[PDB]
Amino acid sequence: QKLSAYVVDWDLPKSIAWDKLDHIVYAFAEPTKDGELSGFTDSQLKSVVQEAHSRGKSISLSVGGWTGSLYFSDLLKSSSSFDNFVSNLVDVVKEYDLDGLNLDWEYPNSPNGVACNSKDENDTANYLKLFKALREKLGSKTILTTAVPTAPFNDENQQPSTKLDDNWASTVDAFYIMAYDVNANAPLYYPTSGNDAVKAWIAAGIPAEQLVLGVPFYGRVSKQIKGDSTDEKAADPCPNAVATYSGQYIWRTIAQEGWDDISKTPYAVLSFDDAASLQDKVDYAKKQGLGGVMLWSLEMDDDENTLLNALQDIR
Ligand SMILES: [Mg+2]
Ligand SMILES: [Mg+2]
């Protein structure tokens, strides 16, 4: 899986450029307070799985996400909720014939992310309990990945773990660094960036070949002011939460509506990514011996696949 591409349940790519990618990550299934799965479309996940297998491609289900991380901590600290969650993850792998599961908790024991997310000092340890249990329960041929922040999972004082249980690196196949929404939106060099994140995760104990550099097909605008037509005002799943904008401009608005040396990204203020910066990220990933790259998200590209084409050197 040198090149993985996220697709979203609420806006699937009408047509997937299958031979231009290796791996589809389907977002999101949201864990409920009770360890159930929710939020994704049966028929749609079935159909995408069937198409991926027909095209000889692999597909994972992403569990969690920005508004799907409310109950990870609560679920994983307790016992039979942990077990119920593990069993339902095994069962969704059964049901949908999945090649992998991608765990996207944002974030273990963190003040960042959705404000009212459940958080506990033991979140990273129970998260690895979850991964060891999943590797247990699913077999060796199931792909276990996680979408990860720019720094190793927070410790029990809400600081990036300086060392990780190498049962991480031996249980989890790949770690997808979400090196975007940093501030540059997806800076390659920097107080963090893709390079700084790769350094931190390598120093924490995750080898480079199990690290996957995450790149965006969008940019963020600043003067939170509104982005383009897809930036709708939205509130987090917390009572009384203020609804806000993201500032998002997907690549398609940039393209149809017609440089920063330090971060190696383009500015317009709209900080975003084009074929040049994405090629720079690919060159970085190759020079560092990373496992590949992941992209968020596939539907944001244009008809002529500008951004997906600019990534082909990884594969
Ligand atoms: Mg169902
Ligand atoms: Mg996200």
UniProtKB/TrEMBL annotation:
Query: Quick one: a GO biological-process term for this protein?
Result: chitin catabolic process
EC assignment: the record states 3.2.1.14
Report the catalytic activity.
Answer: Random endo-hydrolysis of N-acetyl-beta-D-glucosaminide (1->4)-beta-linkages in chitin and chitodextrins
Q: Which residues form the signal peptide?
A: none
Q: Name one Pfam family in it.
A: Glyco_hydro_18
Which residues does UniProt call coiled coil? none
Between which residues do disulfide bridges form? 116-238
Please give the PROSITE patterns that the UniProt record associates with this protein. GH18_1, GH18_2
Is Metal-binding among the key words of this record?
A: yes
The UniProt keywords, alphabetically, are: Carbohydrate metabolism, Chitin degradation, Glycosidase, Hydrolase, Metal-binding, Polysaccharide degradation
Q: What class of enzyme is it?
A: hydrolase
Domain (GH18) ranges? 1-315
Q: Name one GO cellular component term.
A: extracellular region
A single MF term (Gene Ontology): chitin binding
SMART domains attached to this UniProt entry: Glyco_18 (SM00636)
What is the protein name stated in its UniProt record?
Fungal chitinase from Rhizomucor miehei (Native protein)
Organism equals Rhizomucor miehei
